[PDB]
Each structure stands twice: as structure tokens, then as C-alpha cells.
Swiss-Prot record:
It comes from Cryphonectria parasitica (Chestnut blight fungus). The lineage of its organism: Eukaryota, Fungi, Dikarya, Ascomycota, Pezizomycotina. The keyword Iron-sulfur does not apply. Residues 17-328 form the Peptidase A1 domain. GO terms for molecular function: aspartic-type endopeptidase activity. This is Endothiapepsin. The keyword Endoplasmic reticulum does not apply.
Length: 330
């Protein structure tokens, strides 16, 4: 089997992407944030504290003839940005882009943090990291991908995120029309439960490529590109007037600037992030200070190849017995 679904930016900055997901019988369609940095499929629901729901579409398990309470199971997750959610668990039928999993754990939120409430466009998350990170207790549950894997034509999914435009998540096949040149594959460590890999270096603009190993995670659920302070300083030093602002929480730059591109290495191959992808706009409405899309990972504890990086590529998440990651230009 295969599946193919369009993923759409939630706003004009590509802060996140939502993908429609069918849950239950009859189908209830919710727009979920597909997150290769976590492993829980959780939704706003009829059980979510009323004051914490503000515009989201909710899953109502009592209206699904295939929903079953997973007795005694609870979940609770905290994300790298300090947001969180928790609740109980149902199993139900879940379909993405024509691909159906029966008996998928659907984690129903009883509580969500303010960042989730305040984002009316995101109805929940669909985790696509390794199932070892799943938070359901006392019986850990499998991701949608893990459940689908054996049925898929090939045990893979791909992320093709757009810049200020829709893109695609495919399951079970590689669309050879969706990228240019060849796909370069690179080793993955699953030791921390992430799609963790090692970039071979970087360049700033038209500058020379610096060969250096950068361990990090391919994370569709993180907006920006978080890299070591040395690398990030070298990038912003090429933008007149750019500076790190402790008050704002990162590098800012004059909105009048033209940003250089940023290249990252994948083996001997190179992925080029155009300068415009690194512009996250005014820090506040009407400001002439703009927020940068490349930020320091210092104090995160891990480098994160988030959407800024991934949207410059066609990315293969290969879930074969020994997982790997593939990147192609597009």
C-alpha cells in the first residue's frame, strides 16, 4: 500500500505545516502537525478542557463506531519549546492520504498548554520519530508509520515541504518526479529515538565549504534551523546589522537586508537553503527588526534540522531494518 497527502503552511511564515488526517468511522478529519521529532499521535478532543479549546477541530470518540478506550492508558508529553499536553488513549482507524491503519493509538488530550490553545490551525500532532519515544503508559504505543510499515510497498516516508506553498508527505514510495538529481543517503542513529544524522559541513552564501561534522536531527515539527553557535555566528556575520538579542531570544537582522544562502552537506552532496527561507519577518508587527531562521542550538543540547532546512530538500525517511535518511535537491 501507499499514501499521499498534501501538507500546507499554517501561516505566511511557514511556522508549521498541517496535513489532513481521517480518524474514526465515519471519518473525522483533523489537521495534524506531522512531527518527525516526536512519537505521539495526539488530538484535541471532546475530552479537552473547554477553556483550552479555541477554534480547533476536535475528535469525538463517542461518535466513532471503531473507537475503543485503551483501558488504563495515559500519556503526557513536553516539547522542546516548553509546550505540553496530556490525556488518555483510544484505538481507532486512522487514514493519511489513502493509507489506512486499524488499531492506531489516538491520544486524546484532556489538557494542552497555552501555545496549543492559541494556535487555532493545529488540531494535534502525528509523531513520526521512533516508537521508543512514545509516551503512552503503562503500555507504549507505536507510531502511525510503525503500524503501517509492513503493509507499505517500501518501508519509507518522504517529506517534501514547500516554501510559502503546499508540499507533500508520501508513505510507501519515492516519487522520482519530485526532486532533481540523485538522492544522497546518510546513516541514522536511533539511540535517542530521533532521525539523527551527521551533516558533513556548511557554507555561507558563495563562501567556501567548511568540512565539519554536525550531528543533528531531521525534525519536521521544528520551524527553524538550530546549529552550533560557531556556525550560526559565521552566518549572521555576513548580514550587516545582524545581532543576537537576548531580549528577543535570538538573532535578529535589519528587515532591509538581503540574506545570503546557507548550504549544508549530506555526504559529498550539498543542499542549498536560499536566503529568503531564513527570513521570519518582523519581530513584532511594524518593526524593522526581523527574526532569523538560523539560530543557535546552544542550550538545546542538540542540533535541529527543522523546516528551514528540510523545505530546501526532498527528504526520505527510510525505515528499513537499518534506518537511513536521504536528501535530494528539488
Amino acid at each position: 500500500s501507499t499514501g499521499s497527502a498534501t501538507t500546507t503552511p499554517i501561516d505566511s511564515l511557514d511556522d508549521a505545516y498541517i496535513t489532513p488526517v481521517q480518524i474514526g468511522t465515519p471519518a473525522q478529519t483533523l489537521n495534524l502537525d506531522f512531527d518527525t521529532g516526536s512519537s505521539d499521535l495526539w488530538v484535541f478532543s471532546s475530552e479537552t478542557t473547554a477553556s483550552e479549546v479555541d477554534g480547533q477541530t476536535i475528535y469525538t470518540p463517542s461518535k466513532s463506531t471503531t473507537a475503543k478506550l485503551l483501558s488504563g492508558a495515559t500519556w503526557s508529553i513536553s516539547y522542546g519549546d516548553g509546550s505540553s499536553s496530556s490525556g488518555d488513549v483510544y484505538t481507532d482507524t486512522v487514514s493519511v492520504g489513502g493509507l489506512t491503519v486499524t488499531g492506531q493509538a489516538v491520544e486524546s488530550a484532556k489538557k494542552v498548554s497555552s501555545s496549543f490553545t492559541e494556535d487555532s490551525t493545529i488540531d494535534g500532532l502525528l509523531g513520526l520519530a521512533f516508537s521508543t519515544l512514545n509516551t503512552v503508559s503503562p503500555t507504549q504505543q507505536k507510531t502511525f508509520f510503525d503500524n503501517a510499515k509492513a503493509s507499505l510497498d517500501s518501508p519509507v516516508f518522504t517529506a517534501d515541504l514547500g516554501y510559502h506553498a503546499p508540499g507533500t508527505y508520501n508513505f510507501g514510495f519515492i516519487d522520482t518526479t519530485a526532486y532533481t538529481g540523485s538522492i544522497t543517503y546518510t546513516a541514522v542513529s536511533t539511540k535517542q529515538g530521533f532521525w539523527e544524522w551527521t551533516s558533513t559541513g556548511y557554507a555561507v552564501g558563495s563562501g567556501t565549504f567548511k568540512s565539519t561534522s554536525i550531528d543533528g536531527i531531521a525534525d519536521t515539527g521544528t520551524t527553524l534551523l538550530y546549529l552550533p553557535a560557531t556556525v550560526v555566528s559565521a552566518y549572521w556575520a555576513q548580514v550587516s546589522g545582524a545581532k543576537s538579542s537576548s531580549s528577543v531570544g535570538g538573532y535578529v537582522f535589519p528587515c532591509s537586508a538581503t540574506l545570503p544562502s546557507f548550504t549544508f552537506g549530506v555526504g559529498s552532496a550539498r543542499i542549498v537553503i536560499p536566503g529568503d527561507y531564513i527570513d521570519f519577518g518582523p519581530i513584532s508587527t511594524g518593526s524593522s527588526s526581523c527574526f532569523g531562521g538560523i539560530q543557535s542550538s546552544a542550550g538545546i543540547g542538540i542540533n535541529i534540522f527543522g523546516d528551514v532546512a528540510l523545505k530546501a530538500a526532498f527528504v526520505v525517511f527510510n525505515g528499513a531494518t537499518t534506518p537511513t535518511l536521504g536528501f535530494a535537491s528539488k
